[PDB]
Each structure stands twice: as C-alpha cells, then as structure tokens.
GROMACS .gro file of C-alpha atoms in nm:
model
  451
    1UNK     CA    1  -1.513 -13.518  -8.205
    2UNK     CA    2  -1.300 -13.689  -8.482
    3UNK     CA    3  -1.168 -13.558  -8.797
    4UNK     CA    4  -1.012 -13.802  -9.119
    5UNK     CA    5  -0.775 -13.673  -9.358
    6UNK     CA    6  -0.904 -13.663  -9.706
    7UNK     CA    7  -0.752 -13.592 -10.034
    8UNK     CA    8  -0.674 -13.215 -10.163
    9UNK     CA    9  -0.625 -13.137  -9.818
   10UNK     CA   10  -0.279 -12.952  -9.712
   11UNK     CA   11  -0.124 -13.110  -9.397
   12UNK     CA   12   0.270 -13.096  -9.241
   13UNK     CA   13   0.432 -13.449  -9.155
   14UNK     CA   14   0.558 -13.414  -8.778
   15UNK     CA   15   0.768 -13.646  -8.564
   16UNK     CA   16   0.949 -13.602  -8.229
   17UNK     CA   17   1.268 -13.595  -8.110
   18UNK     CA   18   1.399 -13.603  -7.724
   19UNK     CA   19   1.623 -13.250  -7.723
   20UNK     CA   20   1.845 -13.206  -7.385
   21UNK     CA   21   1.577 -13.300  -7.137
   22UNK     CA   22   1.325 -13.131  -7.345
   23UNK     CA   23   1.038 -13.227  -7.604
   24UNK     CA   24   1.099 -13.119  -7.935
   25UNK     CA   25   0.870 -13.119  -8.216
   26UNK     CA   26   0.984 -13.110  -8.606
   27UNK     CA   27   0.759 -13.080  -8.905
   28UNK     CA   28   0.953 -13.227  -9.276
   29UNK     CA   29   1.069 -12.956  -9.486
   30UNK     CA   30   1.218 -12.856  -9.822
   31UNK     CA   31   1.279 -12.530 -10.046
   32UNK     CA   32   1.277 -12.735 -10.350
   33UNK     CA   33   1.438 -12.539 -10.591
   34UNK     CA   34   1.813 -12.645 -10.684
   35UNK     CA   35   1.801 -12.706 -10.286
   36UNK     CA   36   1.588 -13.107 -10.311
   37UNK     CA   37   1.703 -13.220  -9.995
   38UNK     CA   38   1.428 -13.277  -9.730
   39UNK     CA   39   1.531 -13.136  -9.346
   40UNK     CA   40   1.296 -13.078  -9.054
   41UNK     CA   41   1.204 -12.758  -8.925
   42UNK     CA   42   1.140 -12.666  -8.556
   43UNK     CA   43   0.802 -12.609  -8.462
   44UNK     CA   44   0.775 -12.606  -8.036
   45UNK     CA   45   0.991 -12.252  -8.001
   46UNK     CA   46   0.680 -12.122  -8.218
   47UNK     CA   47   0.569 -11.858  -7.885
   48UNK     CA   48   0.889 -11.637  -7.911
   49UNK     CA   49   1.072 -11.786  -8.282
   50UNK     CA   50   0.795 -11.857  -8.565
   51UNK     CA   51   0.864 -12.151  -8.804
   52UNK     CA   52   0.884 -12.149  -9.152
   53UNK     CA   53   0.578 -12.291  -9.254
   54UNK     CA   54   0.550 -12.192  -9.589
   55UNK     CA   55   0.768 -12.490  -9.708
   56UNK     CA   56   0.635 -12.759  -9.460
   57UNK     CA   57   0.286 -12.768  -9.667
   58UNK     CA   58   0.240 -13.067  -9.819
   59UNK     CA   59  -0.087 -13.099 -10.070
   60UNK     CA   60  -0.228 -13.508 -10.086
   61UNK     CA   61  -0.273 -13.502 -10.454
   62UNK     CA   62  -0.325 -13.875 -10.395
   63UNK     CA   63  -0.446 -14.136 -10.197
   64UNK     CA   64  -0.454 -14.494 -10.398
   65UNK     CA   65  -0.505 -14.896 -10.293
   66UNK     CA   66  -0.218 -15.126 -10.377
   67UNK     CA   67  -0.424 -15.238 -10.705
   68UNK     CA   68  -0.531 -14.947 -10.766
   69UNK     CA   69  -0.126 -14.750 -10.752
   70UNK     CA   70  -0.052 -15.077 -10.998
   71UNK     CA   71  -0.265 -14.999 -11.258
   72UNK     CA   72  -0.176 -14.568 -11.302
   73UNK     CA   73   0.207 -14.717 -11.298
   74UNK     CA   74   0.090 -14.961 -11.579
   75UNK     CA   75  -1.437 -13.592 -10.480
   76UNK     CA   76  -1.207 -13.647 -10.224
   77UNK     CA   77  -1.128 -13.911 -10.087
   78UNK     CA   78  -1.046 -14.017  -9.763
   79UNK     CA   79  -0.758 -14.208  -9.662
   80UNK     CA   80  -0.706 -14.550  -9.527
   81UNK     CA   81  -0.459 -14.720  -9.383
   82UNK     CA   82  -0.246 -14.927  -9.617
   83UNK     CA   83  -0.327 -14.689  -9.908
   84UNK     CA   84   0.019 -14.548 -10.093
   85UNK     CA   85  -0.039 -14.155 -10.072
   86UNK     CA   86   0.134 -13.865 -10.301
   87UNK     CA   87   0.283 -13.599 -10.128
   88UNK     CA   88   0.284 -13.231 -10.350
   89UNK     CA   89   0.522 -12.963 -10.247
   90UNK     CA   90   0.291 -12.663 -10.181
   91UNK     CA   91   0.574 -12.370 -10.242
   92UNK     CA   92   0.699 -12.567 -10.518
   93UNK     CA   93   0.486 -12.804 -10.634
   94UNK     CA   94   0.752 -13.111 -10.675
   95UNK     CA   95   0.661 -13.429 -10.497
   96UNK     CA   96   0.781 -13.575 -10.192
   97UNK     CA   97   0.999 -13.861 -10.290
   98UNK     CA   98   1.292 -14.122 -10.181
   99UNK     CA   99   1.596 -14.026 -10.306
  100UNK     CA  100   2.466 -14.569  -9.307
  101UNK     CA  101   2.287 -14.778  -9.534
  102UNK     CA  102   1.974 -14.511  -9.545
  103UNK     CA  103   1.830 -14.330  -9.894
  104UNK     CA  104   1.796 -13.940  -9.892
  105UNK     CA  105   1.474 -13.795  -9.912
  106UNK     CA  106   1.357 -13.524 -10.123
  107UNK     CA  107   1.167 -13.309 -10.416
  108UNK     CA  108   1.138 -13.501 -10.756
  109UNK     CA  109   0.988 -13.294 -11.048
  110UNK     CA  110   0.780 -13.594 -11.130
  111UNK     CA  111   0.478 -13.805 -11.001
  112UNK     CA  112   0.563 -14.133 -11.252
  113UNK     CA  113   0.835 -14.312 -11.042
  114UNK     CA  114   0.711 -14.525 -10.757
  115UNK     CA  115   0.967 -14.318 -10.559
  116UNK     CA  116   0.725 -14.039 -10.459
  117UNK     CA  117   0.452 -14.289 -10.326
  118UNK     CA  118   0.439 -14.444  -9.941
  119UNK     CA  119   0.195 -14.627  -9.797
  120UNK     CA  120   0.040 -14.540  -9.521
  121UNK     CA  121   0.056 -14.775  -9.162
  122UNK     CA  122  -0.064 -14.793  -8.822
  123UNK     CA  123   0.182 -14.728  -8.552
  124UNK     CA  124  -0.019 -14.963  -8.306
  125UNK     CA  125  -0.302 -15.176  -8.238
  126UNK     CA  126  -0.561 -14.948  -8.223
  127UNK     CA  127  -0.582 -14.901  -8.615
  128UNK     CA  128  -0.623 -15.219  -8.868
  129UNK     CA  129  -0.554 -15.198  -9.250
  130UNK     CA  130  -0.859 -15.027  -9.486
  131UNK     CA  131  -0.994 -14.841  -9.178
  132UNK     CA  132  -0.977 -14.429  -9.172
  133UNK     CA  133  -0.685 -14.272  -9.037
  134UNK     CA  134  -0.767 -13.998  -8.811
  135UNK     CA  135  -0.596 -13.668  -8.747
  136UNK     CA  136  -0.385 -13.722  -8.398
  137UNK     CA  137  -0.312 -14.096  -8.522
  138UNK     CA  138   0.048 -14.162  -8.515
  139UNK     CA  139   0.177 -14.375  -8.841
  140UNK     CA  140   0.427 -14.497  -9.026
  141UNK     CA  141   0.529 -14.455  -9.355
  142UNK     CA  142   0.688 -14.674  -9.580
  143UNK     CA  143   0.851 -14.570  -9.957
  144UNK     CA  144   0.667 -14.796 -10.249
  145UNK     CA  145   1.041 -14.753 -10.414
  146UNK     CA  146   1.283 -14.876 -10.192
  147UNK     CA  147   1.027 -15.050  -9.913
  148UNK     CA  148   1.244 -14.809  -9.646
  149UNK     CA  149   1.055 -14.601  -9.376
  150UNK     CA  150   1.072 -14.230  -9.373
  151UNK     CA  151   1.223 -14.191  -9.095
  152UNK     CA  152   1.441 -13.931  -8.856
  153UNK     CA  153   1.807 -14.011  -8.813
  154UNK     CA  154   1.987 -13.893  -8.537
  155UNK     CA  155   1.774 -13.422  -8.653
  156UNK     CA  156   1.798 -13.509  -9.024
  157UNK     CA  157   1.540 -13.695  -9.253
  158UNK     CA  158   1.594 -13.991  -9.469
  159UNK     CA  159   1.444 -14.342  -9.536
  160UNK     CA  160   1.588 -14.670  -9.362
  161UNK     CA  161   1.454 -14.965  -9.222
  162UNK     CA  162   1.466 -14.827  -8.894
  163UNK     CA  163   1.126 -14.671  -8.809
  164UNK     CA  164   0.981 -14.359  -8.702
  165UNK     CA  165   0.595 -14.199  -8.576
  166UNK     CA  166   0.497 -13.940  -8.801
  167UNK     CA  167   0.220 -13.723  -8.736
  168UNK     CA  168   0.037 -13.599  -9.059
  169UNK     CA  169  -0.147 -13.273  -8.907
  170UNK     CA  170  -0.350 -13.108  -9.074
  171UNK     CA  171  -0.330 -12.770  -9.251
  172UNK     CA  172  -0.628 -12.693  -9.408
  173UNK     CA  173  -0.943 -12.878  -9.585
  174UNK     CA  174  -1.238 -12.703  -9.806
  175UNK     CA  175  -1.230 -12.338  -9.764
  176UNK     CA  176  -1.544 -12.149  -9.830
  177UNK     CA  177  -1.446 -11.918 -10.166
  178UNK     CA  178  -1.343 -11.553 -10.119
  179UNK     CA  179  -1.281 -11.599  -9.776
  180UNK     CA  180  -0.936 -11.515  -9.578
  181UNK     CA  181  -0.706 -11.831  -9.459
  182UNK     CA  182  -0.392 -11.856  -9.283
  183UNK     CA  183  -0.116 -11.928  -9.479
  184UNK     CA  184  -0.226 -11.693  -9.767
  185UNK     CA  185  -0.016 -11.450  -9.959
  186UNK     CA  186  -0.182 -11.129  -9.981
  187UNK     CA  187  -0.152 -10.765 -10.035
  188UNK     CA  188  -0.313 -10.475  -9.781
  189UNK     CA  189  -0.474 -10.230  -9.991
  190UNK     CA  190  -0.611  -9.866  -9.790
  191UNK     CA  191  -0.867  -9.707  -9.982
  192UNK     CA  192  -0.691  -9.509 -10.516
  193UNK     CA  193  -0.395  -9.826 -10.529
  194UNK     CA  194  -0.217  -9.772 -10.185
  195UNK     CA  195  -0.059 -10.130 -10.046
  196UNK     CA  196   0.118 -10.129  -9.714
  197UNK     CA  197   0.463 -10.246  -9.767
  198UNK     CA  198   0.810 -10.154  -9.667
  199UNK     CA  199   1.081  -9.990  -9.887
  200UNK     CA  200   1.301 -10.143 -10.153
  201UNK     CA  201   1.581 -10.300 -10.162
  202UNK     CA  202   1.962 -10.135 -10.061
  203UNK     CA  203   1.731  -9.839  -9.918
  204UNK     CA  204   1.883  -9.653  -9.589
  205UNK     CA  205   1.625  -9.759  -9.317
  206UNK     CA  206   1.713 -10.097  -9.376
  207UNK     CA  207   1.390 -10.246  -9.526
  208UNK     CA  208   1.285 -10.247  -9.140
  209UNK     CA  209   1.055  -9.953  -9.163
  210UNK     CA  210   0.675 -10.005  -9.304
  211UNK     CA  211   0.453  -9.731  -9.567
  212UNK     CA  212   0.204  -9.728  -9.727
  213UNK     CA  213   0.270  -9.666 -10.064
  214UNK     CA  214   0.048  -9.620 -10.454
  215UNK     CA  215   0.144  -9.659 -10.801
  216UNK     CA  216   0.389  -9.966 -10.936
  217UNK     CA  217   0.489 -10.075 -10.589
  218UNK     CA  218   0.072 -10.303 -10.561
  219UNK     CA  219   0.256 -10.520 -10.875
  220UNK     CA  220   0.583 -10.579 -10.660
  221UNK     CA  221   0.686 -10.805 -10.442
  222UNK     CA  222   0.761 -10.583 -10.193
  223UNK     CA  223   0.442 -10.529 -10.081
  224UNK     CA  224   0.335 -10.877 -10.024
  225UNK     CA  225   0.267 -11.056  -9.696
  226UNK     CA  226   0.147 -11.388  -9.560
  227UNK     CA  227  -0.076 -11.464  -9.265
  228UNK     CA  228   0.023 -11.645  -8.978
  229UNK     CA  229  -0.206 -11.768  -8.719
  230UNK     CA  230  -0.034 -11.900  -8.348
  231UNK     CA  231  -0.122 -12.245  -8.430
  232UNK     CA  232   0.028 -12.493  -8.640
  233UNK     CA  233  -0.298 -12.743  -8.680
  234UNK     CA  234  -0.542 -12.554  -8.870
  235UNK     CA  235  -0.340 -12.282  -8.940
  236UNK     CA  236  -0.481 -12.262  -9.349
  237UNK     CA  237  -0.833 -12.225  -9.161
  238UNK     CA  238  -1.053 -11.944  -9.184
  239UNK     CA  239  -0.923 -11.607  -9.042
  240UNK     CA  240  -1.175 -11.420  -8.734
  241UNK     CA  241  -1.205 -11.084  -8.648
  242UNK     CA  242  -1.002 -11.113  -8.338
  243UNK     CA  243  -0.809 -11.401  -8.384
  244UNK     CA  244  -0.433 -11.324  -8.331
  245UNK     CA  245  -0.192 -11.347  -8.547
  246UNK     CA  246   0.138 -11.269  -8.720
  247UNK     CA  247   0.237 -11.061  -9.074
  248UNK     CA  248   0.495 -11.201  -9.227
  249UNK     CA  249   0.697 -11.007  -9.531
  250UNK     CA  250   0.773 -11.295  -9.757
  251UNK     CA  251   1.070 -11.136  -9.938
  252UNK     CA  252   1.246 -11.017  -9.654
  253UNK     CA  253   1.112 -11.330  -9.414
  254UNK     CA  254   1.026 -11.038  -9.150
  255UNK     CA  255   0.773 -10.979  -8.948
  256UNK     CA  256   0.551 -10.661  -8.858
  257UNK     CA  257   0.556 -10.604  -8.469
  258UNK     CA  258   0.541 -10.307  -8.203
  259UNK     CA  259   0.877 -10.269  -8.021
  260UNK     CA  260   0.929  -9.995  -7.734
  261UNK     CA  261   1.284  -9.869  -7.890
  262UNK     CA  262   1.123  -9.774  -8.219
  263UNK     CA  263   0.761  -9.833  -8.273
  264UNK     CA  264   0.630 -10.047  -8.566
  265UNK     CA  265   0.924 -10.201  -8.796
  266UNK     CA  266   0.956 -10.535  -8.915
  267UNK     CA  267   1.175 -10.780  -8.711
  268UNK     CA  268   1.383 -11.051  -8.790
  269UNK     CA  269   1.241 -11.432  -8.732
  270UNK     CA  270   1.419 -11.495  -8.415
  271UNK     CA  271   1.318 -11.177  -8.235
  272UNK     CA  272   0.964 -11.215  -8.314
  273UNK     CA  273   0.799 -11.334  -8.003
  274UNK     CA  274   0.413 -11.284  -7.965
  275UNK     CA  275   0.308 -11.009  -7.790
  276UNK     CA  276   0.591 -10.802  -7.997
  277UNK     CA  277   0.416 -10.926  -8.301
  278UNK     CA  278   0.048 -11.053  -8.285
  279UNK     CA  279  -0.223 -10.868  -8.446
  280UNK     CA  280  -0.554 -10.887  -8.532
  281UNK     CA  281  -0.860 -10.729  -8.784
  282UNK     CA  282  -1.142 -10.556  -8.603
  283UNK     CA  283  -1.459 -10.506  -8.764
  284UNK     CA  284  -1.448 -10.122  -8.544
  285UNK     CA  285  -1.245  -9.961  -8.317
  286UNK     CA  286  -1.500 -10.005  -8.031
  287UNK     CA  287  -1.355 -10.118  -7.709
  288UNK     CA  288  -1.390 -10.529  -7.715
  289UNK     CA  289  -1.594 -10.642  -7.346
  290UNK     CA  290  -1.621 -11.008  -7.489
  291UNK     CA  291  -1.215 -12.068  -7.840
  292UNK     CA  292  -1.053 -12.312  -8.089
  293UNK     CA  293  -1.254 -12.493  -8.328
  294UNK     CA  294  -1.055 -12.801  -8.465
  295UNK     CA  295  -1.097 -12.792  -8.832
  296UNK     CA  296  -1.179 -12.485  -9.088
  297UNK     CA  297  -1.378 -12.316  -8.856
  298UNK     CA  298  -1.682 -12.040  -8.931
  299UNK     CA  299  -1.552 -11.780  -9.274
  300UNK     CA  300  -1.554 -11.417  -9.146
  301UNK     CA  301  -1.340 -11.189  -9.370
  302UNK     CA  302  -1.346 -11.168  -9.718
  303UNK     CA  303  -1.132 -11.067  -9.966
  304UNK     CA  304  -1.182 -10.744 -10.097
  305UNK     CA  305  -1.526 -10.680 -10.002
  306UNK     CA  306  -1.471 -10.677  -9.594
  307UNK     CA  307  -1.264 -10.402  -9.430
  308UNK     CA  308  -1.049 -10.440  -9.167
  309UNK     CA  309  -0.884 -10.232  -8.867
  310UNK     CA  310  -0.544 -10.397  -8.799
  311UNK     CA  311  -0.470 -10.379  -8.428
  312UNK     CA  312  -0.136 -10.471  -8.202
  313UNK     CA  313  -0.327 -10.746  -7.948
  314UNK     CA  314  -0.098 -10.669  -7.638
  315UNK     CA  315  -0.066 -10.254  -7.675
  316UNK     CA  316  -0.384 -10.230  -7.815
  317UNK     CA  317  -0.261 -10.000  -8.112
  318UNK     CA  318  -0.412  -9.935  -8.472
  319UNK     CA  319  -0.214  -9.969  -8.732
  320UNK     CA  320  -0.243  -9.611  -8.949
  321UNK     CA  321  -0.025  -9.368  -9.124
  322UNK     CA  322   0.156  -9.088  -8.982
  323UNK     CA  323   0.041  -8.735  -9.179
  324UNK     CA  324   0.285  -9.096 -10.192
  325UNK     CA  325   0.431  -9.271  -9.936
  326UNK     CA  326   0.324  -9.191  -9.566
  327UNK     CA  327   0.471  -9.402  -9.283
  328UNK     CA  328   0.306  -9.688  -9.134
  329UNK     CA  329   0.305  -9.601  -8.693
  330UNK     CA  330   0.121  -9.744  -8.403
  331UNK     CA  331  -0.114  -9.494  -8.262
  332UNK     CA  332  -0.323  -9.498  -7.980
  333UNK     CA  333  -0.672  -9.322  -8.206
  334UNK     CA  334  -0.556  -9.350  -8.562
  335UNK     CA  335  -0.774  -9.249  -8.846
  336UNK     CA  336  -1.105  -9.264  -8.907
  337UNK     CA  337  -1.050  -9.431  -9.249
  338UNK     CA  338  -0.762  -9.708  -9.150
  339UNK     CA  339  -1.018  -9.968  -9.271
  340UNK     CA  340  -0.758 -10.181  -9.529
  341UNK     CA  341  -0.963 -10.452  -9.776
  342UNK     CA  342  -0.740 -10.778  -9.874
  343UNK     CA  343  -0.655 -10.929 -10.224
  344UNK     CA  344  -0.526 -11.241 -10.281
  345UNK     CA  345  -0.197 -11.292 -10.448
  346UNK     CA  346  -0.201 -11.567 -10.711
  347UNK     CA  347   0.069 -11.841 -10.728
  348UNK     CA  348   0.330 -11.735 -10.973
  349UNK     CA  349   0.388 -11.425 -10.797
  350UNK     CA  350   0.381 -11.571 -10.437
  351UNK     CA  351   0.595 -11.841 -10.599
  352UNK     CA  352   0.839 -11.558 -10.738
  353UNK     CA  353   0.844 -11.378 -10.406
  354UNK     CA  354   0.978 -11.677 -10.176
  355UNK     CA  355   1.235 -11.807 -10.451
  356UNK     CA  356   1.363 -11.412 -10.429
  357UNK     CA  357   1.378 -11.490 -10.037
  358UNK     CA  358   1.551 -11.814 -10.060
  359UNK     CA  359   1.785 -11.672 -10.356
  360UNK     CA  360   1.863 -11.354 -10.129
  361UNK     CA  361   1.929 -11.555  -9.794
  362UNK     CA  362   2.112 -11.824  -9.942
  363UNK     CA  363   2.388 -11.571 -10.197
  364UNK     CA  364   2.413 -11.342  -9.859
  365UNK     CA  365   2.522 -11.573  -9.685
  366UNK     CA  366   2.736 -11.693  -9.944
  367UNK     CA  367   2.868 -11.327  -9.937
  368UNK     CA  368   2.893 -11.345  -9.606
  369UNK     CA  369   3.180 -11.594  -9.595
  370UNK     CA  370   3.396 -11.420  -9.818
  371UNK     CA  371   3.381 -11.084  -9.563
  372UNK     CA  372   3.514 -11.354  -9.359
  373UNK     CA  373   3.800 -11.478  -9.548
  374UNK     CA  374   3.935 -11.145  -9.583
  375UNK     CA  375   3.183 -12.241  -9.166
  376UNK     CA  376   3.214 -12.434  -9.561
  377UNK     CA  377   3.072 -12.158  -9.886
  378UNK     CA  378   2.760 -12.354 -10.030
  379UNK     CA  379   2.903 -12.402 -10.308
  380UNK     CA  380   2.677 -12.654 -10.400
  381UNK     CA  381   2.344 -12.486 -10.291
  382UNK     CA  382   2.486 -12.142 -10.524
  383UNK     CA  383   2.560 -12.332 -10.825
  384UNK     CA  384   2.238 -12.548 -10.804
  385UNK     CA  385   2.003 -12.242 -10.729
  386UNK     CA  386   2.216 -12.028 -11.016
  387UNK     CA  387   2.133 -12.321 -11.222
  388UNK     CA  388   1.781 -12.321 -11.143
  389UNK     CA  389   1.713 -11.971 -11.176
  390UNK     CA  390   1.902 -11.947 -11.527
  391UNK     CA  391   1.640 -12.244 -11.621
  392UNK     CA  392   1.370 -12.046 -11.459
  393UNK     CA  393   1.485 -11.728 -11.640
  394UNK     CA  394   1.557 -11.921 -12.014
  395UNK     CA  395   1.380 -11.732 -12.262
  396UNK     CA  396   1.097 -11.965 -12.442
  397UNK     CA  397   1.238 -12.162 -12.743
  398UNK     CA  398   1.063 -12.342 -13.024
  399UNK     CA  399   0.397 -11.372 -12.637
  400UNK     CA  400   0.203 -11.497 -12.335
  401UNK     CA  401   0.553 -11.694 -12.194
  402UNK     CA  402   0.702 -11.353 -12.283
  403UNK     CA  403   0.522 -11.159 -12.100
  404UNK     CA  404   0.547 -11.362 -11.830
  405UNK     CA  405   0.905 -11.348 -11.782
  406UNK     CA  406   0.942 -11.061 -11.803
  407UNK     CA  407   0.766 -10.992 -11.486
  408UNK     CA  408   0.954 -11.228 -11.344
  409UNK     CA  409   1.265 -11.098 -11.461
  410UNK     CA  410   1.065 -10.711 -11.347
  411UNK     CA  411   0.965 -10.886 -10.961
  412UNK     CA  412   1.349 -10.970 -10.923
  413UNK     CA  413   1.475 -10.660 -11.081
  414UNK     CA  414   1.288 -10.475 -10.810
  415UNK     CA  415   1.385 -10.680 -10.514
  416UNK     CA  416   1.748 -10.550 -10.606
  417UNK     CA  417   1.847 -10.938 -10.742
  418UNK     CA  418   2.061 -10.789 -10.967
  419UNK     CA  419   2.320 -10.562 -10.780
  420UNK     CA  420   2.304 -10.883 -10.530
  421UNK     CA  421   2.431 -11.147 -10.832
  422UNK     CA  422   2.683 -10.829 -10.910
  423UNK     CA  423   2.772 -10.828 -10.544
  424UNK     CA  424   2.874 -11.211 -10.587
  425UNK     CA  425   3.045 -11.128 -10.890
  426UNK     CA  426   3.261 -10.860 -10.762
  427UNK     CA  427   3.392 -11.059 -10.461
  428UNK     CA  428   3.479 -11.356 -10.652
  429UNK     CA  429   3.656 -11.126 -10.909
  430UNK     CA  430   3.901 -11.032 -10.658
  431UNK     CA  431   4.068 -11.334 -10.737
  432UNK     CA  432   4.197 -11.437 -11.042
  433UNK     CA  433   3.507 -12.057 -10.793
  434UNK     CA  434   3.482 -12.106 -11.167
  435UNK     CA  435   3.180 -12.270 -11.154
  436UNK     CA  436   2.978 -12.021 -10.979
  437UNK     CA  437   3.148 -11.677 -11.142
  438UNK     CA  438   3.040 -11.804 -11.499
  439UNK     CA  439   2.687 -11.899 -11.391
  440UNK     CA  440   2.621 -11.592 -11.200
  441UNK     CA  441   2.734 -11.374 -11.539
  442UNK     CA  442   2.463 -11.624 -11.758
  443UNK     CA  443   2.195 -11.525 -11.471
  444UNK     CA  444   2.296 -11.125 -11.505
  445UNK     CA  445   2.251 -11.185 -11.893
  446UNK     CA  446   1.918 -11.384 -11.828
  447UNK     CA  447   1.797 -11.157 -11.594
  448UNK     CA  448   1.844 -10.868 -11.825
  449UNK     CA  449   1.758 -10.973 -12.176
  450UNK     CA  450   1.477 -10.877 -12.307
  451UNK     CA  451   1.457 -10.568 -12.108
   0.00000   0.00000   0.00000
C-alpha cells in the first residue's frame, strides 16, 4: 500500500549520512526559544538511546502552488511536487525558514516572508511536477527566498547550492477525537486526584524516584509525561493495548525504567535502552497468550474513560504503589486498584514544561563550566534564552493574561527555577559576564513580580 502527505499532518524531515562505516539517520531539530538555529538529531540509535523527538515535529500548515503563493504574498490538501510548503514547528509554533557561501536555516516567528516557504521537487525521474508526494519518496527542498537547497553540510543543516535528499516521514495524520496517540503530553491519574510524578526540584532522592501524589502536584509540571512508541514513523499514531512504549518525564527529560539495582526509577536518555525502559498499557492483569500498521491505526485508548494497567514489558511487572505521597514500584502482583486513567495536557502547560526542560539544561551546562574554571560558555545561548524568558514573563501593558502569567510563574517556581537563576547569579558575582548578570536579575524580578 501507499500513502500521501496532506496539510495539517505532522512530519519529521530526515536525511542520511555515512559515519565510520555505518549509516546514520538524522532529523531536522530546533528548540526555538532564543536558540533558533536548526541542528541534526540522530535517530539511528533509538533502540539504545531515545532521540529528542518532541522538537523534530513539524506541521504542514500550508501547501500552495507558485501562483497561489504569489497571491498570498501580494479540508486537508494533498502535497504535490512543485508546491511550496509552510512548516510550523510543533513546540515553538514558529516556522522553518532560511536565515562557505551557505545561508543558515532556523525558526522565524512569522509566516509573512518568503523565507519560510520551501518548494518540493523530485529526487529522481520516478516522479513528475504536479504529482502526489508519497511517503518514502526521496525529495529535494529549495528555499523560496534564497533559491537554495535545504542541505546537510559536513553534521549541520544549512541552505546552499549543493543539494541533499530528504525524507518527509509522517508522524501523524487525522486522529480520532479523545483517543491517546504517541507524542502526547499527559498525566496518569490514580483514582481523589492523585497522579504519577517525581519529586520537586532539589529533593534528597535526586529527582530519580517515582511517586503517586495528590494535591497541587496535579497542576504542576513535574507530573507531566510524554508517551513515546518504539517508532519514528507513525510514532504519533493511536496507542494500542500491549504496544511497547517509553514514558518520558518532560521537565527532567528522563525515562521511566526498571533497573536491576534500584527497581523502578527514572533514568537519563543515555541509559534508556528498550529492555529497561519499555512499558505498555494493559486492559487487565491476565496472562497475554497471543503487526505494525503503517498509519494512524485503530483507536483503542480513550482519555479519561479508559482504565489502564501499566506493565513493564521485559519483566512483566506491574506499576503500583508501596503500601499523601506513596512511592511507585514495579511488582509481580501489584494491587487490585492499579488501573490508571489518562488526561491530556493542554498546549500552554506542555509548552512551558518543555521550556523548563531546555532552560534547566542550558543553565546547568553554563554552571558546569564555571565549576571547571574554579568548553566555551554558552554565552550567546544564555543571553538569548534570558531575553526570551523576560519577554515570556513580561507583564501585559496597555486580567486573563494576568492569570496566565501567574500560572507560568508558578510552574517555573515549582520546578526550582528561582534558585537555579540565583545559583547562576551567586557564581557570576564571585567575580567583581556583565550582560548575563543584569539579565539574570531582571528575570528574577519577572518571576517574582505580582506574587
């Protein structure tokens, strides 16, 4: 069978390279908040190390002919060769755009210019202009603004006159309303609001243990998880009962796992190999006595309505509580009330949780280099990130926007972002550099203002 790409479907842009007598596949990736420059995310070693897929997803917002494009400048449509496409970054909501003799490629805030448009062209004589773009086709993408090819420079991405072959691999298409798909950020609730979570920032358990917890946590970022099937293509398809998948903690970026040494913990991406890190949802605890569809597949698990037992695949152990804040363990029998229900996180909350992840990771790297000087400091990155967050926490000038602001502030504060910003300040103030110090203080005020 064959399938086509349509507008509003989500995709990864994939290219290939030969690395040390081994073939490597890389996806187009960008963070999109201060760090607007695109980079390559290797997806070949997924069985051992899960890729950072969240920021590789692009939505095909628009697909227009050359004549239709010029008109705009002055349901779901199928992609045709010769059409110009508009690629909206899922996380940042910004657009892929054209920034020796090669122009950079990054994210731009507005789809107004020609810079964010790319025409699709066949890689061989197998396809013709005006024909449907198929899934699995090798294609060439040229920038409308610069007339240059989106290209893998040698691993980096830029726009040049040297061309490279891309695969626009489908992440998801139209999904059934209310059904859980891969790549979704959600909460796992147990029975009285009590959800699966890890500890708050700067706890003694090193943020590596899992708990069932009630109260305010159900509205905090630390209880957010992303479901990640063992696929790249159609990783955003409907989740099935018994389907193996990884469960990623959003703010921390670590993976739910079973270890021989500690049991149920949350481990770093570098140590999250499928055997330790694969879970699945089960209808019941009965012994399973009994194929991967290309596409969205059958819808099986409903948000809210479906009750699911979580099982670690390799061991067969059940996710359960040790007999309000109960520790989560993996156990041979578990409890009769182990069934969880799932609730989808909304855009603002999930976006903020990923912003926390990226911010914490960058500022931790910035702190690390200083303990060494007691690898260039990410000065340009830190400044831009700081500048972005100040605007992010900027009080609206000229009540609903005030409620949103206070929720954003709360989300960051509960993820230990105040002490983290302080932790940078105290390290920089040791020396009597000047750009960041002022920006860090300004963000500090922005996080506090109106509390």
